[PDB]
């Protein structure tokens, strides 16, 4: 029932790059969907205390949020894009794991996710 720790966003020996990928993934990709009308609840770590979900953290070992993607990207922990992508695909697939089909949050994520495919389908080749 208690939150765990945050995921990392901060890792100095972890071996960095900033790539023309990753770029396209701030400027466009995050800043599509940060901007969104369904953002709001997908912009930090699910507060499982506040929410009162206390199976929240025992369904979801591997959490994700676009906070921590947002800090991920300005603070360039990234070495490459497909890291980026499968942290917005796990966000997307711990929200559809523990929720309802049509809960309003599945809907939101869907709304999310449909701008994201459409997005990385555009994503630059890597120069
Ligand atoms: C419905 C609670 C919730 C929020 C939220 O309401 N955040 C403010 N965000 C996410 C990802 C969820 C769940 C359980 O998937």
């Known amino acids: 029932s208690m939150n765990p720790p945050p995921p ?7 071996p960095k790059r900033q790539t023309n990928q990753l770029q396209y993934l701030l400027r466009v990709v995050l800043k599509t969907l940060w901007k969104h009308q369904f953002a709001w609840p997908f912009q930090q770590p699910v507060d499982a205390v506040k929410l009162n ?4 953290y025992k369904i979801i070992k591997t959490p994700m949020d676009m906070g921590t ?3 991920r990207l ?3 922990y990234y070495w490459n894009a497909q890291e ?5 695909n796990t966000m997307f697939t711990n929200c559809y794991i523990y929720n309802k089909p049509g809960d309003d949050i ?10 994201f495919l459409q997005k990385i389908n555009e994503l630059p080749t890597e120069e």
């Open 74 to 76: 300005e603070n360039n």
């Open 106 to 115: 599945v809907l939101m994520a869907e709304a999310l996710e449909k701008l």
């Open 84 to 88: 980026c992508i499968q942290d917005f």
């Open 8 to 14: 990392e966003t901060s890792n100095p020996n972890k």
């Open 53 to 56: 979900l206390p199976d929240y």
């Open 69 to 71: 993607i947002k800090k």
